[PDB]
């Protein structure tokens, strides 16, 4: 298979390349053909987030606060089996603003389109398009409420997108198809207060959308159905036809353990998200999702909350920087004990670890193609 992993310490990209049952910790064990740097940029300017365009093409989001096109060029090695190059193409750059540390949350296609999104810690949304000259050219930065932990766009209909943060309550937001202009539709309420009379924290971390709520619907109204992870251990639920406060909020660890991420997942490793992540079902008791603690563990939950079990108990030493579901089967993961992992999804078996010598915040799988 082959990857692309961040590397924050040094600001680059490595390419894996490496067969199921590579283990670098194992010496008797399989190890990889080929890993190699590129696009070193620095700690000053490490990678954010990656989108893969297609196997020629793919995006970058740097924290020096750079958007960059990047071509992708593969050459045959001189067991045999191509590498990639990567050459930037276009560039953006000045899309932070540390003075209201900044970072991008998100970086993804808005639908033929060539149209991205890039989001700010900081609350600014850029819509970023390749022209037809094939340069990146910047057509709005909209402002929204900081501080800004994820941004969330709707892809299901049965644009739209949520976003949230520190005490910044979860918000849906209407964009115009120009990106000149959006609209606030929807804003959550917080839960009453606890057992002790006390208030509860608002710090939503991520959050996941699912399809309309079935049935007869009311007028004035909105049907947006998602679910979302909390900085205070949270599993907070929503139905807009129920109202602006969560109708589930679950405590998922004991002491408000912080969490961070939400991927949604099948019990058997079945593809029933779409492009964006989002749950394509209607129904909450269907929803699995997997998140983090920033410690070292990585655990995953059902719709009501109940812990379904560790993935890498046992190996994962580090807090697990980042969690992706790839194709429904495969989880990728990569944190600070700068391990790159690959997990069966149905099974929890782990098929590739890869040591990279770099804290790790971002994986992409460009194929999962057995080496021969």
Same mark, same amino acid.
């Given at each position: 298979?082959?990857?692309?992993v961040?590397?924050?310490?040094?600001?680059?990209?490595k390419?894996?390349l490496?067969?199921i049952?590579?283990?670098?910790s194992v &010496?008797?064990?399989?190890?990889?053909?080929?890993?190699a740097?590129?696009?070193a940029?620095?700690?000053? !300017?490490?990678?954010?987030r990656m989108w893969?365009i297609?196997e020629? #093409?793919?995006?970058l989001?740097?924290?020096?606060?750079v958007?960059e096109?990047?071509?992708?060029?593969?050459?045959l090695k001189e067991?045999?089996?191509?590498?990639? #190059?990567?050459?930037?193409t276009?560039?953006?750059?000045d899309?932070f603003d540390?003075?209201?540390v900044d970072?991008?949350?998100?970086?993804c296609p808005?639908?033929?389109?060539?149209?991205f999104?890039?989001?700010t810690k900081?609350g600014?949304?850029h819509?970023?398009?390749k022209?037809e000259?094939?340069?990146?050219?910047k057509?709005?930065?909209?402002?929204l409420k900081?501080?800004?932990?994820f941004?969330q766009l709707?892809?299901?209909?049965?644009?739209?997108?949520?976003?949230?943060?520190?005490?910044?309550?979860i918000?849906?937001?209407?964009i115009?198809?120009s990106?000149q202009?959006?609209?606030?539709?929807w804003?959550?309420?917080?839960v009453?207060?606890?057992?002790?009379?006390?208030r509860?924290?608002?710090?939503?971390?991520?959050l996941?959308?699912?399809?309309?709520?079935?049935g007869?619907?009311?007028?004035?109204?909105l049907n947006?159905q998602?679910? !979302?992870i909390?900085?205070?251990?949270?599993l907070?639920?929503?139905?807009?036809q129920h109202?602006?406060?969560?109708?589930?909020?679950i405590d998922?660890?004991?002491?408000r353990?912080?969490?961070?991420?939400?991927?949604?997942?099948?019990?058997?490793?079945e593809?029933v998200?779409s492009?964006?992540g989002?749950?394509?079902?209607?129904?909450?008791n269907?929803?699995?999702?997997i998140?983090?603690?920033?410690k070292?563990?990585v655990?995953?939950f059902?719709?009501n909350?109940?812990?379904?079990?560790?993935?890498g108990?046992?190996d994962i030493?580090g807090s697990?920087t980042y969690?992706?579901?790839?194709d429904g089967?495969?989880?990728? &993961?990569g944190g600070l004990?700068?391990?790159?992992?690959?997990?069966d999804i149905?099974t929890?078996?782990m098929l590739?670890?890869?040591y990279?010598?770099s804290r790790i915040?971002?994986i992409?799988?460009l194929?999962?193609? #057995?080496?021969?």
């Amino acid at each position: 298979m082959r990857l692309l992993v961040s590397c924050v310490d040094s600001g680059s990209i490595k390419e894996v390349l490496c067969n199921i049952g590579t283990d670098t910790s194992v &010496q008797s064990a399989l190890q990889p053909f080929h890993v190699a740097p590129h696009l070193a940029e620095g700690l000053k !300017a490490y990678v954010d987030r990656m989108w893969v365009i297609s196997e020629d #093409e793919a995006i970058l989001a740097r924290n020096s606060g750079v958007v960059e096109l990047v071509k992708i060029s593969k050459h045959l090695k001189e067991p045999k089996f191509d590498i990639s #190059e990567f050459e930037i193409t276009s560039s953006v750059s000045d899309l932070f603003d540390d003075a209201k540390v900044d970072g991008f949350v998100t970086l993804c296609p808005i639908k033929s389109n060539n149209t991205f999104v890039a989001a700010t810690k900081s609350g600014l949304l850029h819509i970023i398009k390749k022209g037809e000259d094939k340069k990146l050219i910047k057509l709005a930065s909209l402002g929204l409420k900081a501080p800004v932990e994820f941004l969330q766009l709707y892809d299901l209909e049965d644009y739209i997108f949520a976003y949230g943060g520190e005490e910044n309550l979860i918000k849906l937001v209407e964009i115009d198809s120009s990106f000149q202009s959006l609209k606030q539709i929807w804003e959550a309420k917080n839960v009453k207060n606890d057992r002790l009379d006390m208030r509860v924290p608002v710090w939503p971390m991520a959050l996941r959308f699912l399809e309309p709520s079935p049935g007869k619907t009311e007028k004035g109204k909105l049907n947006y159905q998602f679910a !979302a992870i909390t900085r205070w251990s949270h599993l907070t639920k929503y139905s807009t036809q129920h109202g602006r406060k969560p109708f589930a909020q679950i405590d998922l660890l004991p002491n408000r353990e912080p969490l961070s991420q939400m991927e949604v997942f099948d019990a058997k490793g079945e593809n029933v998200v779409s492009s964006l992540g989002n749950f394509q079902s209607e129904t909450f008791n269907e929803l699995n999702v997997i998140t983090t603690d920033y410690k070292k563990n990585v655990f995953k939950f059902d719709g009501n909350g109940r812990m379904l079990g560790k993935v890498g108990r046992d190996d994962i030493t580090g807090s697990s920087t980042y969690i992706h579901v790839h194709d429904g089967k495969y989880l990728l &993961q990569g944190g600070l004990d700068r391990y790159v992992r690959i997990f069966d999804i149905k099974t929890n078996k782990m098929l590739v670890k890869v040591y990279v010598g770099s804290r790790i915040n971002f994986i992409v799988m460009l194929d999962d193609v #057995e080496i021969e």
